[PDB]
Design an enzyme around this catalytic site. Structure first.
Site, PDB file in Angstrom:
ATOM      1  N   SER A   1     -35.197 -33.987  33.747  1.00  0.00           N
ATOM      2  CA  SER A   1     -35.209 -32.854  34.668  1.00  0.00           C
ATOM      3  C   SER A   1     -36.327 -31.845  34.464  1.00  0.00           C
ATOM      4  CB  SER A   1     -33.866 -32.152  34.755  1.00  0.00           C
ATOM      5  OG  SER A   1     -33.096 -32.751  35.704  1.00  0.00           O
TER       6      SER A   1
ATOM      7  N   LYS B   1     -38.774 -31.344  37.333  1.00  0.00           N
ATOM      8  CA  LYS B   1     -38.462 -30.477  38.406  1.00  0.00           C
ATOM      9  C   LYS B   1     -39.469 -29.296  38.495  1.00  0.00           C
ATOM     10  CE  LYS B   1     -33.560 -31.485  38.979  1.00  0.00           C
ATOM     11  NZ  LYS B   1     -33.515 -32.797  38.399  1.00  0.00           N
TER      12      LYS B   1
ATOM     13  N   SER C   1     -30.471 -27.468  37.793  1.00  0.00           N
ATOM     14  CA  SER C   1     -30.850 -28.859  37.571  1.00  0.00           C
ATOM     15  C   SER C   1     -30.211 -29.776  38.612  1.00  0.00           C
ATOM     16  CB  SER C   1     -30.496 -29.302  36.148  1.00  0.00           C
ATOM     17  OG  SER C   1     -31.410 -30.282  35.712  1.00  0.00           O
TER      18      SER C   1
ATOM     19  N   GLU D   1     -34.525 -38.934  41.860  1.00  0.00           N
ATOM     20  CA  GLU D   1     -33.226 -38.797  41.206  1.00  0.00           C
ATOM     21  C   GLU D   1     -32.258 -39.817  41.803  1.00  0.00           C
ATOM     22  OE1 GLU D   1     -33.941 -35.378  38.497  1.00  0.00           O
ATOM     23  OE2 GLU D   1     -32.583 -37.080  38.636  1.00  0.00           O
TER      24      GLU D   1
ATOM     25  N   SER E   1     -32.170 -33.665  30.623  1.00  0.00           N
ATOM     26  CA  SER E   1     -31.178 -34.468  29.929  1.00  0.00           C
ATOM     27  C   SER E   1     -31.162 -35.856  30.552  1.00  0.00           C
ATOM     28  CB  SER E   1     -29.800 -33.802  30.032  1.00  0.00           C
ATOM     29  OG  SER E   1     -28.774 -34.670  29.607  1.00  0.00           O
TER      30      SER E   1
END
EC number: 3.5.2.6
Length: 260
Positions: A43, A46, A103, A139, A210
């Site tokens: 993440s 991002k 997230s 994702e 994560s």
């Protein structure tokens, strides 16, 4: 050095693989531990995607206010903010805030789509001089964090320099960089990571990550009182595919860096 001894010992105690990059902008000195090894970003990628949309808004002035439909098929693995707006809309601002501060994986995918796919995120990285970042998947498959897989990785050295350019340098316009800094300072997911190893009097903005193989990441810009800010990247990943998160390693790495 002394910091590298303690980082190596932290890594040895942890059973995993630790990567650290610090940039002290006071003297532009660097502390690196496995600074050129690839790590799965998870993440933390991002930040690059939200910054790329911010760079677009430099030309499309109202871009951040454009509504984006959230549809049931849009949902993937972890969608805490977007699941609240299915069959409605969110603006690219609210999607950028959701991606960065919670997230939200659906929000990341809307940013990727706005950029034309993962190649549009990688393109923005190359455009600001990051030759190392690579985003290959959307994702949530970008979190497989498979040992040795180059997809969706970067190195601590590269991500620290990029995060510096984005939030302290001028890779973005001033309005855009201020909004990124604001978003990062309002992250809700980082209390046990880098923030937990730093003096409470320091202001922090950060993006955690994560993934599988117990991958536990954090990238932060840090404003101590009195002195020039720092940029700190801490990446960590583990041998077992089902390994537990280890945010404590990131906190302890930051503590070791702050003491040096």
């Amino acid at each position: 050095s002394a910091v590298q001894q303690k980082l190596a010992a932290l890594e040895k105690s942890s059973g995993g693989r630790l990567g650290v990059a610090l940039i002290d902008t006071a003297d532009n000195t660097q502390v690196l531990y496995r600074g050129d090894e690839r790590f799965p970003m998870c993440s933390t990628s991002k930040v690059m995607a939200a910054a790329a949309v911010l760079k677009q808004s430099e030309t499309q002035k109202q871009l951040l206010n454009q509504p984006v439909e959230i549809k049931p098929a849009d949902l993937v693995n972890y969608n805490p903010i977007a699941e609240k707006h299915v069959n409605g809309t969110m603006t690219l601002a609210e999607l950028s805030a959701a991606a960065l501060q919670y997230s939200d994986n659906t929000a990341m995918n809307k940013l990727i789509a706005q950029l034309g796919g993962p190649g549009g995120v990688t393109a923005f990285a190359r455009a600001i001089g990051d030759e190392t970042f690579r985003l290959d998947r959307t994702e949530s498959t970008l979190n497989t964090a498979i040992p040795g897989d180059p997809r969706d990785t970067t190195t601590p050295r590269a991500m620290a320099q990029t995060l510096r350019q984005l939030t302290l340098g001028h890779a973005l316009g001033e309005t855009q960089r201020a909004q990124l800094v604001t978003w990062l300072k309002g992250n809700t997911t980082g209390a046990a990571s880098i923030r937990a190893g730093l003096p409470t009097s320091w202001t922090v903005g950060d993006k955690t990550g994560s993934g599988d193989y117990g991958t536990t990441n954090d990238i932060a810009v840090i404003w101590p009182q009195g002195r020039a800010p720092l940029v700190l990247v801490t990446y960590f990943t583990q041998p077992q595919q089902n390994a537990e998160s280890r945010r404590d390693v990131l906190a302890s790495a930051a503590r070791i860096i702050a003491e040096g």
